[PDB]
Write an enzyme that holds these catalytic residues in place. Structure first.
Site, mmCIF file in Angstrom:
data_model
loop_
_atom_site.group_PDB
_atom_site.id
_atom_site.type_symbol
_atom_site.label_atom_id
_atom_site.label_comp_id
_atom_site.label_asym_id
_atom_site.label_seq_id
_atom_site.Cartn_x
_atom_site.Cartn_y
_atom_site.Cartn_z
ATOM 1 N N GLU A 126 10.445 -48.760 -71.074
ATOM 2 C CA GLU A 126 10.615 -47.762 -70.042
ATOM 3 C C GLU A 126 9.511 -47.865 -69.004
ATOM 4 O O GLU A 126 9.726 -47.580 -67.834
ATOM 5 C CB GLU A 126 10.628 -46.377 -70.662
ATOM 6 C CG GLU A 126 11.742 -46.192 -71.675
ATOM 7 C CD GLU A 126 13.109 -46.649 -71.148
ATOM 8 O OE1 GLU A 126 13.496 -47.828 -71.362
ATOM 9 O OE2 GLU A 126 13.791 -45.821 -70.509
ATOM 10 N N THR A 179 15.553 -43.124 -61.348
ATOM 11 C CA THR A 179 14.508 -42.232 -61.802
ATOM 12 C C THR A 179 13.230 -42.197 -60.931
ATOM 13 O O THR A 179 12.276 -41.501 -61.245
ATOM 14 C CB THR A 179 14.268 -42.481 -63.322
ATOM 15 O OG1 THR A 179 15.467 -42.125 -64.036
ATOM 16 C CG2 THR A 179 13.135 -41.640 -63.855
HETATM 17 N N1 LIG Z 1 19.141 -53.195 -71.083
HETATM 18 C C1 LIG Z 1 19.144 -52.330 -70.046
HETATM 19 N N2 LIG Z 1 20.015 -51.240 -70.041
HETATM 20 C C2 LIG Z 1 20.045 -50.346 -68.990
HETATM 21 N N3 LIG Z 1 19.266 -50.413 -67.858
HETATM 22 C C3 LIG Z 1 18.394 -51.516 -67.897
HETATM 23 C C4 LIG Z 1 18.296 -52.491 -68.933
HETATM 24 N N4 LIG Z 1 17.372 -53.410 -68.654
HETATM 25 C C5 LIG Z 1 16.910 -53.030 -67.467
HETATM 26 N N5 LIG Z 1 17.484 -51.910 -66.949
HETATM 27 C C6 LIG Z 1 17.032 -51.426 -65.613
HETATM 28 O O1 LIG Z 1 16.227 -50.238 -65.631
HETATM 29 C C7 LIG Z 1 16.791 -49.227 -64.699
HETATM 30 C C8 LIG Z 1 17.457 -48.053 -65.360
HETATM 31 O O2 LIG Z 1 16.542 -46.932 -65.414
HETATM 32 P P1 LIG Z 1 16.975 -45.529 -64.658
HETATM 33 O O3 LIG Z 1 17.464 -45.659 -63.213
HETATM 34 O O4 LIG Z 1 15.875 -44.470 -64.853
HETATM 35 O O5 LIG Z 1 18.226 -45.197 -65.590
HETATM 36 P P2 LIG Z 1 18.299 -44.970 -67.118
HETATM 37 O O6 LIG Z 1 18.353 -43.492 -67.181
HETATM 38 O O7 LIG Z 1 19.581 -45.524 -67.652
HETATM 39 O O8 LIG Z 1 16.949 -45.410 -67.757
HETATM 40 C C9 LIG Z 1 17.645 -50.109 -63.750
HETATM 41 O O9 LIG Z 1 16.905 -50.626 -62.650
HETATM 42 C C10 LIG Z 1 18.200 -51.136 -64.712
HETATM 43 O O10 LIG Z 1 18.836 -52.285 -64.214
HETATM 44 C C1 LIG Z 2 13.084 -40.950 -67.162
HETATM 45 C C2 LIG Z 2 12.482 -39.635 -66.696
HETATM 46 C C3 LIG Z 2 12.745 -38.458 -67.653
HETATM 47 C C4 LIG Z 2 14.248 -38.204 -67.872
HETATM 48 C C5 LIG Z 2 12.044 -37.167 -67.115
HETATM 49 N N1 LIG Z 2 12.100 -36.112 -68.114
HETATM 50 C C6 LIG Z 2 12.668 -36.741 -65.758
HETATM 51 O O1 LIG Z 2 13.490 -35.801 -65.729
HETATM 52 O O2 LIG Z 2 12.320 -37.350 -64.723
#
Ligand SMILES: Nc1ncnc2c1ncn2[C@@H]1O[C@H](COP(=O)(O)OP(=O)(O)O)[C@@H](O)[C@H]1O
Ligand SMILES: CC[C@H](C)[C@H](N)C(=O)O
Ligand SMILES: Nc1ncnc2c1ncn2[C@@H]1O[C@H](COP(=O)(O)OP(=O)(O)OP(O)(O)=S)[C@@H](O)[C@H]1O
Ligand SMILES: CC[C@H](C)[C@H](N)C(=O)O
Ligand SMILES: [Mg+2]
Lengths: 296, 296
Positions: A126, A179
């Site tokens: 993450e 995010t």
């Molecule tokens: N195995 C994976 N599964 C899902 N998202 C991934 C993976 N590997 C990398 N990512 C990347 O990380 C991001 C997803 O994070 P975010 O936008 O916060 O959504 P999520 O809530 O699904 O974590 C994208 O840029 C995405 O392509």
């Molecule tokens: C990935 C971020 C997490 C979900 C956080 N609690 C937010 O709401 O931004």
């Protein structure tokens, strides 16, 4: 020499539990297979074209490498991923892959690591992929039930299993919130009264789980005025939807940073609530509290 | 036509539970007896000539008036109050009389009110004496154990019985802090990171109570960075003592707005910690969690 695992989506924040609370879902989920290969490299395949295959971009490859490195493992691995939900939907799609991989590596290589440690490894995924080593989605993905991330350096996760029935309904809009878009909107300051309100209501939600009181849980969950009002404006028809299901749910709020909406329907109105949701959002799924990553 | 009861001291805040958490003590306690008198008068007799005997001022009188009125008992009362401990020390001395008064009026005058109702009325007492209705000291006084005031109008209180032994040491510095100024110097807003830290740590304390984990309860209690670092500056040697008993207590923090201090000594060091507390302050009390107002 391989293991296949089901890694679930998770809903974080739950209103007044921002950055702390996490609830594990039974569905959707990723299906991840990990195979030990002699070629000391990391190969990744995904059934979602919009997700990286670069072992250093895909969260599963980032977690796998850190663990193979820390345990001086010889083999390399081939990770095959079948995605449960798109990224940017607020259902912890990235966390599912991060937690699932940590769990799978631990099973495949017999590392015997405790859950907290799997959450810590998964958290790296993450980070490298979001600048923040957040664990409020990976903690429930690993532990199942309800979790609370109560400290970061060092990580501390408190788990409350949910042994009673809790029907969940998830509406998934066709829009996306990365995010990063997610936090800018976040207020930089909070008033003392809001801090006091959220602490009181978040504590009441914990009390409610131990007393298996779904009305109390849902009602306090909808009391946040610091973040929810801001984020809700990013979701088409969200406030209208809340109003319309008002007395048929124990509670309803935004899942994670959104745009997905999580509702806990009253037993006698589950179909009615599911139709109202699906009426605004076709991608609506009915589920319940999950148990965390598991071997399949 | 009269009843005798003990109304115990209480400790509010408990660090991250600011304005929500309350813990009932066994000792000190006010000793109160109330006689029903025909002459429509509120005869308040309280030792310590520092407490206003004027039925208009004395909180025990206010709770009497605002109450007698309602239930139209059509009488007056002789209120004999033996104070348990000084006022303005942060031990809910006011709350002891207010709640003590309410619980007696109930028992004595036929009444069958609810503990929440008794906490309710008792609050009006704290209104005229401090300012706001403050229910966080009155709630534990009535419920016993640990309480969380999770909402106001309507007032909501959640009680968690403490069924295990929790040794408590209370130290009372011979100084006075202006409760009210001890407010204005408080921040008016806080960072998101502190909302997050406090929600998590306070929720962790509720989890700790259900898991009968004193060490987790005490450690999280000492994690507040919003109020305690400011208020603690006014309590001589407080920070030095906290560090000095560090490995001998599950936790130690300010009681209410101060200057009183509450510590949860480990069984193996209770005497040694009580002695350290006596060497810095002169007045210390060894007690445990109380069960609230009860017939003497
Ligand atoms: N195995 C994976 N599964 C899902 N998202 C991934 C993976 N590997 C990398 N990512 C990347 O990380 C991001 C997803 O994070 P975010 O936008 O916060 O959504 P999520 O809530 O699904 O974590 C994208 O840029 C995405 O392509
Ligand atoms: C990935 C971020 C997490 C979900 C956080 N609690 C937010 O709401 O931004
Ligand atoms: N029965 C009573 N017992 C104690 N103080 C009383 C009583 N009736 C009125 N008072 C007055 O109310 C004030 C005491 O309340 P506070 O200064 O808030 O102290 P405290 O209640 O011990 O501490 P807090 O608010 O719980 S930290 C004084 O100014 C008293 O004169
Ligand atoms: C007794 C505590 C009172 C009610 C408040 N929490 C304060 O510290 O000022
Ligand atoms: Mg008081």
């Amino acid at each position: 020499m391989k293991v296949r695992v089901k890694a679930p989506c998770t809903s974080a924040n739950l209103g007044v539990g921002f950055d702390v609370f996490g609830l594990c879902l039974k569905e959707p989920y990723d299906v991840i297979e990990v195979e030990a290969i002699d070629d000391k490299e990391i190969i990744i395949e995904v059934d979602d074209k919009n997700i990286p295959t670069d072992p250093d971009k895909n969260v599963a490859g980032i977690v796998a490498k850190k663990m193979i490195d820390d345990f001086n493992i010889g083999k390399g691995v081939k990770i095959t991923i079948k995605k449960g939900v798109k990224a940017g939907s607020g259902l912890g799609s990235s966390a599912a892959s991060s937690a699932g991989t940590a769990y799978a590596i631990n099973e495949l290589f017999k590392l015997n690591l405790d859950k907290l440690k799997l959450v810590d490894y998964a958290s790296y995924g993450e980070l490298a992929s979001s600048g923040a080593k957040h664990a409020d989605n990976v903690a429930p993905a690993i532990f199942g039930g309800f979790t609370m991330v109560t400290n970061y350096e060092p990580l501390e996760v408190l788990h409350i299993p949910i042994d009673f029935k809790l029907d969940i309904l998830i509406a998934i809009p066709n829009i996306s919130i990365n995010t990063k878009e997610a936090r800018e909107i976040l207020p930089k300051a909070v008033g003392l009264k809001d801090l006091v309100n959220n602490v009181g209501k978040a504590c009441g939600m914990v009390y409610a789980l131990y007393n298996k009181d779904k009305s109390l849980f849902g009602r306090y969950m909808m009391s946040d005025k610091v973040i929810e009002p801001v984020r809700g404006k990013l979701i088409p028809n969200y406030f209208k939807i809340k109003e319309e299901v008002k007395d048929k749910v124990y509670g309803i709020t935004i899942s994670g940073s959104g745009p997905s909406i999580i509702a806990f329907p009253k037993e006698e109105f589950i179909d009615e609530v599911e139709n109202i949701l699906r009426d605004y959002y076709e991608n609506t799924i009915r589920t319940e509290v999950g148990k965390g990553v598991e071997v399949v």
